[PDB]
Design a protein around this ligand. Structure first.
Ligand SMILES: *[C@@H]1O[C@H](CO)[C@@H](O[C@@H]2O[C@H](CO)[C@@H](O[C@@H]3O[C@H](CO)[C@@H](O)[C@H](O)[C@@H]3O)[C@H](O)[C@H]2NC(C)=O)[C@H](O)[C@H]1NC(C)=O
Ligand SMILES: *[C@@H]1O[C@H](CO)[C@@H](O[C@@H]2O[C@H](CO)[C@@H](O[C@@H]3O[C@H](CO)[C@@H](O)[C@H](O)[C@@H]3O)[C@H](O)[C@H]2NC(C)=O)[C@H](O)[C@H]1NC(C)=O
Ligand SMILES: *[C@@H]1O[C@H](CO)[C@@H](O[C@@H]2O[C@H](CO)[C@@H](O[C@@H]3O[C@H](CO)[C@@H](O)[C@H](O)[C@@H]3O)[C@H](O)[C@H]2NC(C)=O)[C@H](O)[C@H]1NC(C)=O
Ligand SMILES: *[C@@H]1O[C@H](CO)[C@@H](O[C@@H]2O[C@H](CO)[C@@H](O)[C@H](O)[C@H]2NC(C)=O)[C@H](O)[C@H]1NC(C)=O
Ligand code: NAG
Ligand code: NAG
Ligand code: NAG
Ligand code: NAG
Ligand code: NAG
Ligand code: NAG
Ligand code: NAG
Ligand code: NAG
Ligand code: NAG
Ligand code: NAG
Ligand code: NAG
Ligand code: NAG
Ligand code: NAG
Ligand code: NAG
Ligand code: NAG
Ligand code: NAG
Ligand code: NAG
Lengths: 119, 434, 119, 433, 121, 432
């Protein structure tokens, strides 16, 4: 289901549970291969959300600041005048950078939590 | 200044992708194959404010439909009787019977000695054959394909009747559908909707004329990869169907011959009644109007100051020189030369004679051969001409073509694209963790 | 494993770990199909708990009120005097309706968290 | 006031049909059942559970049947197809050391067949049993199932001896077992336990009588789908075993014949010493007491004053008309009419015939050739039950069956497969946050 | 890099948990398919267990089960430094199931306690 | 003392394990339709600074895995091919005397026979040449009295190409980089890799061709060198170049068997008929044995004599050297390489070869393959990278045996381990 596609980013987020549910729900070796792949793709995304400290959420806020390098557009002109497809293309060359930064942040946060609990 | 990365999951975005599709439906080979039922509800979701780019000649759904039909076709012939024991010298004479038209000499009465259930004995049997199945070596004949391959008898209970097949996306994937009534075959399309499954497509196998497909909403849509390069096939989709009435008029029977311990052959038996030529009837007025519609639209790419002519085509293979048509259980090779011989400058009907072939070498392969069991009784088919495959040669001349098979599916799959859903992504927000 | 199946729900609720821990651990095509399905069923339940905001928990409380429509039995007679099998028979048609409500509640909650964290 | 609370790990289930796997501990069931099981019995008792069980329309039975046919066929794939040998035979009726009871039973048949090189032939001879040899329609004979199908030779190194087989649930599924003793194949059952694997069941092939298997816990149990419907079979499970010992008192030899590229056909060779008919011995007193118990529990459905009489089989092929005691590589067809002649020294003997070309599972497009066994066969086994049919003031019961599912329902009747559904919802005095 | 910290001390390797974790889930052909299915099953068994213990979503989970000197009678200075994870794994191998059982019991009690605290409002 | 349990996920530990490895390759070859997964150039190796891993090449399951996969691949590729059952007829044979440069005396024969054709009601008379080793004036082929002979498809190449084995998810391969690693015990310079270096699946006997070389000196390896009943593998420090040829300019005759069924028969020979042979550099070979001797004495004593001699198990699998040169089967006589006594106190070597076409491969006797003839002239130039030696003063001879010993010469440095990311340790914190 891609029904919100084409709507703006600030509108499309209203349906994140619709898209998430439909990702998993949906000679014979052919079908097993298709099914196994669907499971693997699902789990890869879940592992990333978990490793970044976003487990269980469709929307999570991190402590990694936004770099004007990736995009110098304002909050307005992203959320109101663009759809997600457009956004995805504009920052498609920084995805691996952001993901690496998110992992580093979570590691630092967990270490701090353990040391706080120590008191 | 104060923006932070927010990670979102369930984001409605995608990328072009090539994945595995499965079929769904509603002793037919496809009914057995497509065990998954369809949802009676099309579940079509319109996508507002999108412009998706499509390209019907780069569409991998075509390769899967082709691959699936070859694989299914072959799998269904594996557990069947081989006719290797029939590759013996045949003694054949012309059939003498009440034969009309120009069918005299078309059929031969062949006798031969084949194996029996007992290894120590042979039996003398006879059968009728069409000229196109038998090669003369002298009254001495051989079956045509005994020098390159074993001929497998198709199993008599297996139905190859095309039924609608719906292709469905696996989880994580979606199929986008172009609803532009004028769609070009390539480029951006507005009014794109998302579907789970395609409309049903009947896996009809033919050349020159495309039968029982979809119609255009308006006029004629002419689609080809380049137009200018005359080496490409032109797929012409009509907004009106042309009805064609086909028959094999002879009343046939079958002669069941046991050839071994649990194996048997179905021979063409004696013909009951008179012998007549097989043929197809196309209304003349409808056909002339249909060409006028095609030519008028065809001119848009050549000029309105030119001349469009049709030819009866050419080639070294019946599969492409004649109209290859599978009617009931028998393969027809119809003569369309009087259907495509007009020149366009600006009650009645045409009968196309048809030849019947029994030993079939499908998909343009050499190493395999199938024996089509004869069908009892008299055969009649009524089909819908929904499109044409034409090629091009200062007057321009066009002729019937095709035969690659892929082109017979592009005509139905051109409106669909497969995409991969990529639900994870990020964007700046004013929200900070903790 | 299922020792509590015939017991009062108020007692059976304390053996949840036992049932959960036995869901993954206990002719080539048939064995792969058996394994793939066991995984698929497991993941369907985990995704669904995540959608409702109950990931990582065997017991969770939500913000969807109970309707008398689903059951007008009082509380004492639900947790006592009845097994889970019997309860399952009582709540049958009023299942998907609950699931839909749980999803709606969670979406409102995640939006509210995102907005609160922006202050 | 009450809020929705969601629980995971909830002990509930639904009836379900899923694929079960084989567990165990050069047999045909070896290498195909490679999961060692039952190191410790499970038997989790479920207190206060009254589940509904049904011997008929079970899924476990259909899978056992399906899996056995598949395995059986798979085991013959790599062995000689006996393409030759549909040649006609020149047969002599053997009288050498043969008693009157067996005249015409054995034939000495010679024939032409191929060898290692394609254009060479050899003359061989072998013995055959009358049941497998048909006079040609044109002293000249043919093998029976040669004219319509190929006969695959059974693999000489594969044992088809039944071994106990355990069926085990895949993760997410469980097997419930009925421990009631008066259950009789149907309805609600008090005392239900949960297991991962079934007890071992021996896949014994038979007809009319049920051999090695379990006994009823207390009394004879008579199970039927509809006791009033003469079109249904009655499965009778005894609470006592009856021993039967079968033998083929002929010191056989094997004659190895080379076919084509080192393929071998194992022909019956000659017989050393006396030639005698196969037979089975059943204790007379035990059999008469056994029937007395069967009728005592059978009258309960007809009346205390009705008459029950027994009679022999009605017709059909040997698969249904005779007992089909299966010995380690031999198929005996035994005459049970002597066991079913009553109206309600110390042993009864039943004559037996031997067949080598076997058409199994009521199919006709396949055949198997059972190679000979040298020496003398002696089989000792336990009768655990009967398959009977019924057809005024007097009722007649006859041996029946032949539907292999009936030989498996008798062991699988106490098991049911259920799907575990761990997620559920209930109200509570607890609100989020 | 993956396993780069394998020879480092226990307290050093704690900084590479991300690296090991992110590579576990995958970063005649029937055997490839079998391998893929098993890789998923192994992954899920570990994730389910962390869920049972209340450690879902964390690489470092602090629990409320006390450490027994019986399992290993050593100081923090004798464990977190001067020792690698491979050595530690061998050192307490025989207490693995005891610990896992205790962790399960604790989490179950914690869930009940939380439901009661929410109820008391 | 307020110490609590903490759970960590992503812990860098492992256990010894066996599993299924998959193939990958670089860039009509039988392995190119198998190893469909590309390798990574610069695959990346991770050095482990303080790991002392125990390795054991003779207990390495990867050898078994490589072996079973090769046998399976080999058989699978011969299934969709023409069987030669129709040729199991008797032959009428005479000797080829047509310009034989002596020393054959019937090694090459001219045979004819009655075989099938296009129709079942016809037969044809055909002519072909055969090598004596394949033939029992009345003759039969050596493998018509058992099993069946299948013609290898002329369209499939069996040329060895590098094969890389790669770990599945959840596993890693540890590589031993220690100098002079002898096949067993602790290894200090341990590194983690995702795939092996690329092994060519060479199927030679006696001598090991086109493998890896030792970097410092010749390495002698055996499971128990004192057992006197184990093969000793020798890994050389330098390659020895060997030039092998089949000098006769042959032809290929195409014979119809049936409906798309073809047999490729040896046709006539163009030019003089001469023996196949291999040229081994002599000086290199003399230096090579001297290096082996110096090293063998480290296990047997400074006062012993190594004594080289030839083997006796004359089934042509042990006493001769198999190559698969050009896809042809040479069976070369190597006795001239091993007859010397070493006492501590161009002049090249020519080895004759025996060409054979019906091959019972992998020591199985229930299957046979027919190698189609190769037209033209064959020459292979290859690197001797190792030896298989046995012993029983005590005498050393070329060995031979099961293929696992050749493949074990490349996989000796690798181990498969299972990653176990979950673990527990004490810490000073509490859940709260
Ligand atoms: C285009 O669609 C038409 C309509 O579906 C196809 O013609 C139909 O073909 C079927 C199968 O050959 C005919 O059914 C027959 O029915 C008799 C009993 O009435 C039964 O004994 C036969 O075994 C068979 O099932 C059906 O009558 C026929 N319809 C018409 C109007 O003739 C047509 O073949 C399709 N075109 C192409 C190229 O496939
Ligand atoms: C019912 O159960 C009994 C007891 O297990 C079965 O008896 C056994 O049957 C097998 C196969 O006929 C006999 O095996 C043979 O034993 C000889 C011994 O010298 C050996 O040389 C053969 O190679 C083979 O292994 C076994 O001895 C026999 N056991 C006893 C105690 O007599 C009986 O067959 C089962 N009945 C049915 C119908 O399944
Ligand atoms: C050890 O490695 C060498 C190569 O480094 C192997 O020899 C090579 O074998 C191939 C295949 O037999 C030869 O290529 C062929 O060339 C002809 C003519 O150009 C062409 O028609 C064929 O299609 C194919 O491409 C290659 O020339 C040859 N190299 C040399 C130097 O002779 C050698 O076989 C390997 N050792 C073993 C035991 O396999
Ligand atoms: C391998 O062991 C050596 C010591 O044998 C480790 O060296 C220590 O590294 C730390 C890094 O912060 C220094 O503070 C110590 O002073 C070094 N010790 C010595 C004796 O030099 C080395 O780090 C270990 N390898 C790994 C991966 O940790
Ligand atoms: C499409 O654009 C119009 C304005 O031109 C806007 O009103 C409408 O809401 C947009 N549709 C979507 C899906 O956002
Ligand atoms: C974004 O920032 C630029 C800075 O020059 C400003 O001119 C523009 O008006 C801003 N746009 C919005 C939507 O605030
Ligand atoms: C097909 O298109 C032509 C274009 O002129 C139109 O006149 C005709 O009515 C259309 N036919 C149908 C069935 O819509
Ligand atoms: C086909 O036959 C039917 C018989 O009723 C007739 O109505 C129809 O017009 C014919 N079609 C053609 C193309 O002649
Ligand atoms: C079964 O019912 C009795 C009734 O007294 C009760 O005491 C017992 O706890 C119940 N069993 C289970 C497993 O709850
Ligand atoms: C739920 O509660 C509301 C309370 O106003 C009631 O109107 C409604 O009928 C109830 N049932 C359902 C299914 O909504
Ligand atoms: C076999 O031969 C004996 C000879 O006395 C004869 O009595 C018997 O009837 C014969 N049986 C058959 C079937 O020919
Ligand atoms: C074998 O064939 C020959 C053909 O002449 C026939 O005479 C002979 O009797 C046959 N032998 C057997 C045992 O059938
Ligand atoms: C089988 O058990 C059911 C249990 O309700 C009973 O009604 C039925 O009569 C029994 N049938 C026989 C033949 O005992
Ligand atoms: C064989 O059966 C007879 C039946 O009368 C019995 O007495 C004897 O003990 C049985 N033998 C064995 C070994 O069980
Ligand atoms: C576990 O028990 C075995 C018993 O032989 C012992 O050798 C081993 O050292 C023990 N391991 C630990 C961690 O105590
Ligand atoms: C071929 O030569 C050998 C030489 O030893 C001889 O024995 C053999 O008889 C010859 N073959 C023929 C057919 O003359
Ligand atoms: C052998 O070679 C000579 C030329 O040196 C040639 O004349 C003769 O015909 C050849 N003989 C054969 C049998 O080819
Ligand atoms: C074919 O068979 C006949 C049988 O007499 C034999 O003389 C002739 O030599 C054979 N043909 C060949 C090529 O061997
Ligand atoms: C490990 O590598 C170092 C690199 O400097 C080398 O000096 C050392 O000898 C190597 N160790 C072994 C056992 O080869
Ligand atoms: C190694 O060889 C010696 C020779 O005496 C023998 O005693 C010893 O048992 C062998 N050891 C192994 C592990 O094979
Ligand atoms: C080795 O063999 C050659 C002949 O190939 C011979 O001249 C030489 O003397 C032999 N040397 C020894 C040590 O046997």
């Amino acid at each position: 289901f891609l029904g919100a596609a084409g709507s703006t980013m600030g509108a499309a987020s209203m349906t994140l549970t619709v898209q998430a549910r439909n990702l998993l729900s949906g000679w014979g070796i052919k079908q097993l291969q298709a099914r196994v792949l669907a499971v693997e793709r699902y789990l890869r995304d879940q592992q990333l959300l978990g490793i970044w400290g976003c487990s269980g959420k469709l929307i999570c806020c991190t402590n990694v600041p936004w770099n004007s390098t990736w995009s110098n557009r304002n909050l307005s002109e992203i959320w109101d005048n663009m759809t997600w497809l457009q956004w995805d293309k504009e920052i498609s060359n920084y995805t691996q950078i952001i993901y690496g930064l998110l992992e580093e942040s979570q590691n630092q946060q967990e270490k701090n939590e353990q040391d706080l609990l120590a008191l | 200044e104060n923006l932070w990365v927010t990670v979102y999951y369930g984001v409605p975005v995608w990328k072009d992708a090539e994945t595995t599709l499965f079929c769904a439906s509603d002793h037919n080979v496809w009914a057995t194959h497509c065990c998954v039922p369809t949802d009676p509800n099309p579940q079509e979701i319109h996508l507002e404010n999108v412009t998706e780019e499509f390209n019907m000649w780069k569409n991998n759904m075509v390769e899967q439909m082709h691959t699936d039909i070859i694989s299914l076709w072959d799998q269904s012939l594996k557990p069947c009787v081989k006719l290797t024991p029939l590759c013996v010298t045949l003694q054949c004479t012309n059939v003498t019977n009440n034969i009309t038209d120009d069918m005299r000499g078309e059929l031969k009465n062949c006798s031969f000695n084949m194996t029996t259930e007992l290894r120590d004995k042979k039996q003398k049997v006879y059968s009728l054959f069409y000229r196109l199945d038998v090669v003369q070596i002298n009254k001495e004949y051989r079956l045509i394909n005994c020098n390159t391959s074993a001929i497998t008898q198709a199993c008599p209970k297996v139905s190859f009747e095309p039924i609608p097949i719906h292709y469905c996306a696996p989880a994580g994937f979606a199929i986008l559908k172009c609803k532009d009534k004028k769609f070009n075959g390539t480029g951006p399309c507005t009014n794109v909707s998302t579907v789970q499954c395609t409309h049903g497509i009947k896996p009809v196998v033919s050349t020159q004329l495309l039968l029982n497909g979809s119609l255009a909403e308006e006029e004629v849509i002419i689609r080809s990869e380049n137009i200018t390069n005359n080496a490409k096939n032109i797929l012409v989709q009509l907004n009106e169907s042309v009805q064609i009435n086909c028959t094999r008029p002879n009343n046939n029977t079958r002669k069941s011959i046991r050839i071994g311990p649990g194996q048997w052959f179905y021979a063409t038996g004696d013909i009951i009644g008179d012998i007549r030529q097989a043929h197809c009837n196309v209304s003349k007025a409808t056909w002339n109007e249909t060409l006028g519609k095609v030519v008028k639209q065809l001119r848009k790419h050549f000029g309105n100051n030119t001349i469009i002519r049709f030819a009866n085509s050419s080639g070294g293979d019946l599969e492409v020189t004649t109209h290859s048509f599978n009617c009931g259980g028998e393969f027809f090779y119809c003569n369309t030369s009087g259907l495509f011989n007009s020149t366009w400058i600006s009650n009645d009907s045409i009968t196309l004679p048809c030849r019947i072939k029994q030993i079939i070498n499908m998909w343009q392969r050499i190493g395999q051969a199938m024996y089509a069991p004869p069908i009892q009784g008299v055969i009649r088919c009524v089909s819908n001409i929904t499109g044409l495959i034409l090629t091009r040669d200062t007057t321009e001349t066009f002729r019937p073509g095709g035969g690659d098979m892929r082109d017979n599916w592009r005509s139905e799959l051109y409106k669909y694209k497969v995409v991969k859903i990529e639900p994870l992504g990020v964007a700046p927000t004013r929200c900070k963790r903790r």
